[PDB]
Structure 1
Amino acid sequence: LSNKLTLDKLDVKGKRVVMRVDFNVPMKNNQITNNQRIKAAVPSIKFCLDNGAKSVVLMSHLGRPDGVPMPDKYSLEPVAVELKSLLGKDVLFLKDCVGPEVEKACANPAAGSVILLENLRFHVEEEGKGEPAKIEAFRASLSKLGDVYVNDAFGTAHRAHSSMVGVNLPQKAGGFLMKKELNYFAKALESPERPFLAILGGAKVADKIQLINNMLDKVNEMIIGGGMAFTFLKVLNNMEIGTSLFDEEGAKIVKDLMSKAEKNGVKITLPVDFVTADKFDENAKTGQATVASGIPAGWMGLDCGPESSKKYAEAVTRAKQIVWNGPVGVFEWEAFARGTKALMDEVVKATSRGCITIIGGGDTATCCAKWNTEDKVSHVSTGGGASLELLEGKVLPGVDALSNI
């Protein structure tokens, strides 16, 4: 961020600060299961208050409500409660993020006010699909809520969304989390230790399958696991995949990706066996399958099996550096957690013998919280997709939109 305004050089005295954060925290049974992302923003928030900010107005998305209000399902209200405990200051939660009422609440607040707005993605203008003059008006409304802007939303920095690139204030500064994460990656990605392994799992198949092409120019091995694998196996192996996650568009590039991996000498490790489920539920009936057997119709692969874990372990053993985004099964549910646990065990062991190990993402970092490995790997990032986009070698839109020095 040498070329960008950052918070250390932003005069906040008597200024209202409007701050984009990534508070897209994981939730199970209605409760926050990991406050990592909230804690991570506290240094920037406290710095603003300690240096005389009139207010700090915090804004984030939560999940993918796709531009419809879904307060029953994706409200940020529970955040606002957690943030109080972590800050040691109270926080006022607003039930919207624009409108005349939000604008009044933020126009002239009492000294030291911390305000959290409701989920930005309840409005289609944030993404904005899920409307050009309404996008302008949305961006204009957010811009009224502060005198200066800070973006600390590392985990969202890959998204050219209204709150991330569209705020129109004179000073647009990178926050301390943005800086810490970008600095860590700049150093780790400059001359990676090799073999450099990427582990790509998770559930955001449509988006993340599109990152593989450029990642194949940077890494020496790739594990393609979790929900990502089934698109590959359907195409390459003619495997029956049942109701497992599948991306029609990404299927069309699978063979080209494998051709490129071969051209670039990148070893691809796909799973060979699975724990299956009869529905997407923690208490689903379960089974087992191999690539050869296929997955029965109406069943989904929600974890890898033991032979896959062995192949993943082999790749981790060869690695001198690892970047991991996306669990290799639905680790939130114990029936489907073994593959991710086993991989975590391997990644911790790799770290202990000198491997540089980087785990990132809202959900993947929660694997570290669950199994108490946050201090047993080299770096746990609040960015997952954002970190993969750095790995590709791109400038992130949320960084690009900051003020130049």
Structure 2
Amino acid sequence: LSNKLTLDKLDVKGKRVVMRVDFNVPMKNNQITNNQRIKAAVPSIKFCLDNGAKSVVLMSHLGRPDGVPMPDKYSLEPVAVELKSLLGKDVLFLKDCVGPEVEKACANPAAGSVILLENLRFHVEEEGKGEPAKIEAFRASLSKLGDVYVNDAFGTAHRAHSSMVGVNLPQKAGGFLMKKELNYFAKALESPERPFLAILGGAKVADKIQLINNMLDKVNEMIIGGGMAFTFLKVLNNMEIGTSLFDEEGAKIVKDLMSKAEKNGVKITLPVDFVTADKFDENAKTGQATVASGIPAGWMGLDCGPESSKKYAEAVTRAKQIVWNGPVGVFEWEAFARGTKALMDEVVKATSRGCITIIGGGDTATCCAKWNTEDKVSHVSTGGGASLELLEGKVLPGVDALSNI
């Protein structure tokens, strides 16, 4: 961020600060299961308050409510509560993020006020889909809530969304988490140790299958696991995949991706076996399948099996650097957690013999919390897809929109 305004050089004395953060935290049974992303923004928030900010107004999304208000399902109210304990200051929660009531609450706050707005994605204008005039009005409203803007939302920095690129204030500064994460990746990606392995799992298949093409110019090996794998296996192996995650658009480029991996000498490791489930539920009935057997109709693959874990281990053993985004099964539910635990064991072992190991994402970092490995890998990032877009070699939109020096 040498060329961008950052918080260390932003005068906040007597100023209202409006701050985009990534508070898209994981939830199970309605409880926050990892406060990593909240804790990670505390240094920027505290700095603002300690250097005389009149207020700090925090804004984020939670999940993918697709431009409809879903307070019953995706409210940020629980985050406000958690932020209090981590900050040592109280926080006022507002039930919207724009409009006359929100504008009034933020216009002239008591000295030192911390305010958290409701989920930005309850409005279609944040993503811009789910209207140019209402997008402008949404952005205008957000801009009234502070005098200066800070973006500390590293985990969302790949998204060219209204709160991330559309705030119109004279000073738009990168926060300290933004700086910490970008600095770590800049050093780690400049001259990676080789072989350099990417591990791509998870459930955001439509988005992340589109990142593979450019990642194939940067890495020497790739594990394609979790929900990502089934689109590949259906196309390449004619495998029956049941109700497993499948991306129609990505299927159309699978053969081209494999051709490119061959051209570039990138070894691709796909799974060969699975733990199956009869529905998407923690207490589903379960089974086993191989690529050869296929997955029965009406069943979904929610973990890899033991022969897949062996092949993943072989790739980890060859690696001198690893970037991992996306668990290799539904690790939140014990029936489907074994493959991700086994891979974590291998990645921790690799670190101990000198591998540079980077795990990132809202959910994947929660694997580190669950199995107590946060200090047993080289770097745990608050960015998942944001970190993969860095690996591709891009300038992230939320960084690009910051004020130039």
TM-score of the alignment, normalized to the shorter chain, above 0.5: yes
Q: CA deviation at 1:236?
A: 0.2
Between the aligned partners of 1:156 and 1:61, the Cα distance in structure 2 is 9
After superposition, what is the alpha-carbon deviation per residue over 1:18-59, rounded to whole angstroms, capped at 9, x for unaligned?
A: 000000000000000000000000000000000000000000
The corresponding residue for 2:141 is 141
Q: CA deviation at 1:128?
A: 1.1
Q: CA deviation at 1:309?
A: 0.2
> Structure 1: 5+ residue runs without aligned partners?
none
What's the TM-score, normalizing by structure 1?
1.00
SS in 2 for 1:168: coil
Q: CA deviation at 1:216?
A: 0.1
Between the aligned partners of 1:127 and 1:109, the Cα distance in structure 2 is 28
Q: CA deviation at 1:138?
A: 0.2
| Aligned residue pairs, count | 405
SS in 2 for 1:85: helix
Q: CA deviation at 1:124?
A: 0.2
The corresponding residue for 1:362 is 362
Q: CA deviation at 1:238?
A: 0.2
Between the aligned partners of 1:160 and 1:10, the Cα distance in structure 2 is 23
After superposition, what is the alpha-carbon deviation per residue over 1:144-175, rounded to whole angstroms, capped at 9, x for unaligned?
A: 00000000000000000000000000000000
Between the aligned partners of 1:358 and 1:251, the Cα distance in structure 2 is 28
After superposition, what is the alpha-carbon deviation per residue over 1:239-285, rounded to whole angstroms, capped at 9, x for unaligned?
A: 00000000000000000000000000000000000000000000000
SS in 1 for 2:198: strand
Between the aligned partners of 1:46 and 1:246, the Cα distance in structure 2 is 43
Q: CA deviation at 1:391?
A: 0.0
After superposition, what is the alpha-carbon deviation per residue over 1:353-387, rounded to whole angstroms, capped at 9, x for unaligned?
A: 00000000000000000000000000000000000
What's the TM-score, normalizing by structure 2?
1.00
Between the aligned partners of 2:99 and 2:226, the Cα distance in structure 1 is 41
SS in 2 for 1:276: strand
After superposition, what is the alpha-carbon deviation per residue over 1:323-360, rounded to whole angstroms, capped at 9, x for unaligned?
A: 00000000000000000000000000000000000000
After superposition, what is the alpha-carbon deviation per residue over 1:264-322, rounded to whole angstroms, capped at 9, x for unaligned?
A: 00000000000000000000000000000000000000000000000000000000000
After superposition, what is the alpha-carbon deviation per residue over 1:114-146, rounded to whole angstroms, capped at 9, x for unaligned?
A: 000000000000001011000000000000000
After superposition, what is the alpha-carbon deviation per residue over 1:72-119, rounded to whole angstroms, capped at 9, x for unaligned?
A: 000000000000000000000000000000000000000000000000
Q: CA deviation at 1:396?
A: 0.1
Between the aligned partners of 2:140 and 2:294, the Cα distance in structure 1 is 52
SS in 2 for 1:63: coil
Question: In the alignment, is residue 59 of structure 1 matched against residue 59 of structure 2?
Answer: yes
Between the aligned partners of 1:386 and 1:184, the Cα distance in structure 2 is 13
The aligned runs of 1:26-175 (5 Å cut-off) are 26-175=26-175
Q: CA deviation at 1:215?
A: 0.1
SS in 2 for 1:111: coil
Between the aligned partners of 1:136 and 1:56, the Cα distance in structure 2 is 23
User: Percent of aligned positions with the same letter in both sequences?
Assistant: 100
> Structure 2: 5+ residue runs without aligned partners?
none
